[PDB]
Amino acid sequence: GNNQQNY
Amino acid sequence: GNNQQNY
């Protein structure tokens, strides 16, 4: 699906 | 914080 990664 | 909106 839509991807948000906050490292 | 960081924002991602997928309408």
PDB file of N, CA and C in Angstrom:
ATOM      1  N   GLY A   1       0.879  -1.224   0.000  1.00  0.00           N
ATOM      2  CA  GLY A   1       0.000   0.000   0.000  1.00  0.00           C
ATOM      3  C   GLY A   1       0.879   1.223   0.000  1.00  0.00           C
ATOM      4  N   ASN A   2       0.305   2.369   0.364  1.00  0.00           N
ATOM      5  CA  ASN A   2       1.111   3.585   0.577  1.00  0.00           C
ATOM      6  C   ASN A   2       2.123   3.395   1.666  1.00  0.00           C
ATOM      7  N   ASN A   3       3.305   3.963   1.438  1.00  0.00           N
ATOM      8  CA  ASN A   3       4.426   3.809   2.353  1.00  0.00           C
ATOM      9  C   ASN A   3       4.921   5.134   2.938  1.00  0.00           C
ATOM     10  N   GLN A   4       4.961   5.185   4.275  1.00  0.00           N
ATOM     11  CA  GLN A   4       5.667   6.229   5.061  1.00  0.00           C
ATOM     12  C   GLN A   4       6.658   5.612   6.085  1.00  0.00           C
ATOM     13  N   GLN A   5       7.938   5.839   5.849  1.00  0.00           N
ATOM     14  CA  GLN A   5       8.954   5.438   6.817  1.00  0.00           C
ATOM     15  C   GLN A   5       9.667   6.655   7.396  1.00  0.00           C
ATOM     16  N   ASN A   6       9.675   6.707   8.718  1.00  0.00           N
ATOM     17  CA  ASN A   6      10.245   7.825   9.475  1.00  0.00           C
ATOM     18  C   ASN A   6      11.401   7.278  10.267  1.00  0.00           C
ATOM     19  N   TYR A   7      12.596   7.458   9.720  1.00  0.00           N
ATOM     20  CA  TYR A   7      13.804   6.821  10.287  1.00  0.00           C
ATOM     21  C   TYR A   7      14.334   7.580  11.484  1.00  0.00           C
TER      22      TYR A   7
ATOM     23  N   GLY B   1       4.412  15.954  13.113  1.00  0.00           N
ATOM     24  CA  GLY B   1       5.596  15.218  12.542  1.00  0.00           C
ATOM     25  C   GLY B   1       5.522  15.279  11.039  1.00  0.00           C
ATOM     26  N   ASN B   2       6.259  14.394  10.370  1.00  0.00           N
ATOM     27  CA  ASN B   2       6.120  14.243   8.910  1.00  0.00           C
ATOM     28  C   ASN B   2       4.732  13.832   8.524  1.00  0.00           C
ATOM     29  N   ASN B   3       4.264  14.404   7.418  1.00  0.00           N
ATOM     30  CA  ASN B   3       2.907  14.180   6.945  1.00  0.00           C
ATOM     31  C   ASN B   3       2.842  13.543   5.555  1.00  0.00           C
ATOM     32  N   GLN B   4       2.127  12.414   5.480  1.00  0.00           N
ATOM     33  CA  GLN B   4       1.678  11.780   4.215  1.00  0.00           C
ATOM     34  C   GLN B   4       0.145  11.532   4.202  1.00  0.00           C
ATOM     35  N   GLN B   5      -0.543  12.250   3.333  1.00  0.00           N
ATOM     36  CA  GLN B   5      -1.966  12.001   3.125  1.00  0.00           C
ATOM     37  C   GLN B   5      -2.232  11.498   1.711  1.00  0.00           C
ATOM     38  N   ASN B   6      -2.916  10.367   1.651  1.00  0.00           N
ATOM     39  CA  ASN B   6      -3.219   9.675   0.395  1.00  0.00           C
ATOM     40  C   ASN B   6      -4.715   9.680   0.239  1.00  0.00           C
ATOM     41  N   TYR B   7      -5.198  10.636  -0.544  1.00  0.00           N
ATOM     42  CA  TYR B   7      -6.653  10.879  -0.650  1.00  0.00           C
ATOM     43  C   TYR B   7      -7.324   9.895  -1.584  1.00  0.00           C
TER      44      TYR B   7
END
